[PDB]
Automatic annotation (TrEMBL), chains A, B, C, D:
<feature type="domain" description="Inward rectifier potassium channel C-terminal">
    <location>
        <begin position="23"/>
        <end position="192"/>
    </location>
</feature>
<comment type="similarity">
    <text>Belongs to the inward rectifier-type potassium channel (TC 1.A.2.1) family. KCNJ6 subfamily.</text>
</comment>
<protein>
    <recommendedName>
        <fullName>G protein-activated inward rectifier potassium channel 2</fullName>
    </recommendedName>
</protein>
Length: 196, 196, 196, 196
């Protein structure tokens, strides 16, 4: 068995680094199944040359809406669950990570099917916050996915490989996705059908 | 569809800024209906020239009270729910936002009707905390709403408009409200009546 | 009605201050009734000359124990609830505050009566953490209450008075308590008796 | 009764210190019973010469996995519960502490028995984060336990002793464990058997 983190605390990735290069999110988001749950997933990169600490991820849905009483809220914000309640949103960023939002009854995507997706006027805003270990100061890295950048029925190509003791990252596959068989039904639609 | 946040992470608001001007809360708070729930809402402004990070909102009710056992607590503090349990209190402050507190069984306003409002000896304290991106240091901006500054049955005038690619903010409508048809019953009173 | 916090955000306390003096906890803790619940309460002071921010309170019980399997844990730590789950532990420290821990089924004090109190080998550790606004750096102020410093059946003397527009603090009554009629039964004992 | 923390807030440990030495985790993790619950425990050390503040502990499970749909996640991360939901993960680090993760239905170890342990391809990553009081800047200390470093049926040797007023720490027993009678059944297996 090959360790990922040594006793003293130094990680075994990118042999021989120094632990202003910006942080990367995948260009695209995907939606596909994971242990019978529908998920929306994007990948968030690591800082090659340094650690990021009190590191955490969140996501906002920018979508205009009208309240039943008539009130039009242009570009309304509502939080997307990506680990808040369990702490999985507090990241150990030592290699590019797939962040996953389980689309459930409380998810803004509960009712959206594949065909219904590209009709939606919406935008996901991904926000990474953390303190850069060397530097000392707090960072914040943002990116955005509009509808036409969310791919239904795809998965992320694994970037991780282990050769000669260390773990190395194929960075040319970072934004790479691939197609996987996936229902076109909405999350709600899938639970309705299951519950009978 | 016109993006609000670009891939690289720069927002498309106030074309051509530099991303000591203080932050603004609306002068007034309002109470009115939103998807069948009664809400107390105030607006909190953005920092024209910079980002605010680990950005978060909370609110305190200053109200003296007497415990059933006889104990008089002058100017007692109790938290007002404005997103704590879901993370909606963690703000993405890229344009003036309406903060909303759903008046429910746990809300200090559960039992207060329109007529009953102006009799109450109470004060809401709104507190924004965040680290200013450029600067590096933590900010804290406070403001206050007493009874006579909470308007029953109003809504906030939308400040947001999109012209020529960017989103621009009509700041002269920031504190602007308008009247909307709203029940004068208290939140509790409204749920009692509904549940039959 | 006399405001405690003005629109611009400056508080109306201690007329004419500058908003190394250390922070004070009350020397003593008390236990007494509040709206039919038994509570353990201590008072935590304010920083005369400055604000404290991301301000928060927690409390630890230092008490040795033996696990049913035989394991002796000298000076074991277990968290005391003083607002965690609702945010009431996030403080707006603009005047000396009574912190309150509702003694319930999950409280380490559930089973302790008045007579049973002074037999207990225990210690409460109160810890205030916050960033000092002027300074910029994080503070931490600790204090401790052993058994013989927790007074059963007392309350805190209110320090707060309003004269000539501003609110002024009688600091000679900070640590002052007074006796109030209170059951000598334990919290559990009180709920058992009530539930019949 | 001998205090651990004095009124003014100075702790009574290591008589006569100054309150770059790194922080230590125990080399080994253990699994054994605590009040009828199965627990995974590691010990985390203190900073001899200084306080650590906003101090907190978390733990990550690095374990590759395959989703029922076929997706292989190399070196997948999932949070281990070590106090998140109650605040017991927010540490008062004034002497070496045993961190405890109660192995329950939500714990990744629910299904793992003694014999089944050494077959598992897994790694626990322990991460302490805190601000160093003197310094001002944020620390982060990591360590790791692979399978062969988790000892089933052991406990930690207590390091704490009180002599001449102060509490002193036998640091040569920090990583010391000892055997204790413990079931070889998995956590799930133990609950199945109990529930009949
Ligand atoms: Pr290679
Ligand atoms: Pr490829
Ligand atoms: Pr214009
Ligand atoms: Pr207008
Ligand atoms: Pr922080
Ligand atoms: Pr006077
Ligand atoms: Pr007096
Ligand atoms: Pr000695
Ligand atoms: Pr020994």
């Amino acid at each position: 068995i090959q360790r990922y983190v040594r006793k003293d605390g130094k990680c075994n990735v990118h042999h021989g680094n120094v632990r202003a290069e910006t942080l990367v999110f995948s260009t695209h988001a995907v939606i596909s199944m994971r242990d019978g749950k529908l998920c929306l997933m994007f990948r968030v990169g690591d800082l090659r040359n340094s650690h990021i600490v009190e590191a955490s991820i969140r996501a906002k849905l920018i979508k205009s809406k009208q309240t039943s009483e008539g009130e039009f809220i242009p570009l309304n914000q509502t939080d997307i669950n990506v680990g808040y309640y369990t702490g999985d949103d507090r990241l150990f960023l030592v290699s590019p990570l797939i962040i996953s939002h389980e689309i459930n009854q409380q998810s803004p995507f509960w009712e959206i099917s594949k065909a219904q997706l590209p009709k939606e006027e919406l935008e996901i805003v991904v926000i990474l916050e953390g303190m850069v270990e060397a530097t000392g100061m707090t960072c914040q890295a943002r990116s955005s996915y509009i509808t036409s950048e969310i791919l239904w029925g795809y998965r992320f190509t694994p970037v991780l490989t282990l050769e000669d003791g260390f773990y190395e990252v194929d960075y040319n596959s970072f934004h790479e996705t691939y197609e996987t068989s996936t229902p076109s039904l909405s999350a709600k639609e899938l639970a309705e059908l299951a519950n009978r």
